C-alpha cells in the first residue's frame, strides 16, 4: 500500500512521512473560508487489489503554527465534516484498485475575529494528518503521516 504526493514523493509499505507543499489562497478575509484541498495532492493505491482490500481512515489531524492560533476550523473526509484538530476516528474507506485513488481530505479553515496580519508564514507547518491502513488479510496496522506546509503567506485583511 504505497501512497504518493503530487510532487513525486512516496511513502513505502509500512509507513513513514512525506512533506506536502500546498498552495493556499493569497488572502482570506474574515467571515469567509479557506480550502486546503489534499485530494489533489495525496494519492494512494492498493498493491494487490485482486485478493486484499485496504481500509484507510484519518486517525489524527493536528494543527500547527498560525493555524493553531488564528485559524480554528474543520476537516472534510468523504463528505463528513469533523472538528480540527480532530477529536475522533473518521470512518473507513475501501481501497481495492491498482490505480491511484485520491485521499478525500479537505481542510476548511476560517479566520477568527483576530486581525492576524500574516496569519500563516510561508514554509511553516500548518497541518499534520495521519492515515491508518489495516487490511482484511492479517493483523496489520500502518501509519502514513503527512506534514502540510504553506507555500505563500495567507494574509488576513485587517479591515
Amino acid at each position, epitope marked *: 500500500f504505497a501512497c504518493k504526493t503530487a510532487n513525486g514523493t512516496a511513502i513505502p509499505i509500512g*509507513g513513514g*512521512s512525506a512533506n506536502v507543499y500546498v498552495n493556499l489562497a493569497p488572502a482570506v478575509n474574515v467571515g469567509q473560508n479557506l480550502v486546503v484541498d489534499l485530494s489533489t495532492q495525496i494519492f494512494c493505491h492498493n498493491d494487490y487489489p485482486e485478493t486484499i482490500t485496504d481500509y484507510v481512515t484519518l*486517525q*489524527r489531524g*493536528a*494543527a*500547527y*503554527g498560525g493555524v*493553531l*492560533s488564528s485559524f*480554528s476550523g474543520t476537516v472534510k473526509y468523504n463528505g463528513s465534516s469533523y*472538528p480540527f*484538530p*480532530t*477529536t*475522533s*476516528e473518521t470512518p473507513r474507506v475501501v481501497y481495492n484498485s491498482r490505480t491511484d485513488k485520491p485521499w478525500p481530505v479537505a481542510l476548511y479553515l476560517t479566520p477568527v475575529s483576530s486581525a492576524g496580519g500574516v496569519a500563516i508564514k510561508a514554509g*511553516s*507547518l500548518i497541518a*499534520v494528518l*495521519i492515515l491508518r491502513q489495516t487490511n482484511n488479510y492479517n493483523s496489520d496496522d500502518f*501509519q502514513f*503521516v503527512w*506534514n502540510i506546509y504553506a507555500n505563500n503567506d495567507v494574509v488576513v485583511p485587517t479591515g
Partner: antibody
Amino acid sequence: EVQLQQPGAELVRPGASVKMSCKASGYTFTIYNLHWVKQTPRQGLEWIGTIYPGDGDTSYNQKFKGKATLTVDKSSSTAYMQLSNLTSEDSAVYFCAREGDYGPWFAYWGQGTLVTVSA
Amino acid sequence: QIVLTQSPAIMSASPGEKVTMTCRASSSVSSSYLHWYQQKSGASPKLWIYSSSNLASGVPARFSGSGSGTSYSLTINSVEAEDAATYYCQHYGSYPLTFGGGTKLEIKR
C-alpha cells in the same frame, strides 16, 4: 506500553541552566506532539510549550519564552528542556506529556522532574 | 486570552452523595476541546474525561461530564473514597491553552 519517563530530581545552582529529559517508548517517536508543563502549590498547572518531533516545530506559552527551549534528538527517542537564567521562583515539578492517539488531549504523562533551585 | 475559572476549588462530599464541579470559561469554547484530568496529590495527572462528555479508559462510569459553550461542569454520582483528588479543566485547540485553577474534593466520613 507507551511511557514518558522523566528523571526523578534535578538540583541546579541559581543563575545557571539545567537540562532535563523525557524518554518516550512504546510508539513511533516522530508522530505525536510532546508537551511540557509545570506544577506548583501556587496557581495551577502552567503549559510550558510544545514540540512536534517530526519537524522540530516548537511553540512556547507566552511567558516561559526566554526560559524554555524544547529540543528533541529523534535518535534515542528523547525530548529535552533546558532552563535559562534559572531563579528561585522556578522550583517546581515538571511533567512531559503526549497527546492522545485520536485527539488533542493530554493522554500519557510522566513521573515528573522535581527541580529545586538552591546552592 | 481565554481563561478558565474553577468555581468551588474546595468541596466536601459524603461517601454516597452527588457532587458537581463547574469550570467557567472567559469566552465561548467549542465543546470538543475541554478535558478534565484527575491528579491525586503526590502523583501525575491522568486523563479522566475528553470532549467534555466521553470517559477515559479505565475510569469508573460514575463521572458524567456535561455542559457546552461557557459553563462545562462535572458530576460524580456515587462519590467513593477514591475520588478525593484535584480535577483540572484544559481547553486545547486555541494555542494559549489553559489549566484554570483546580477543585480538591474532600470525602467526609
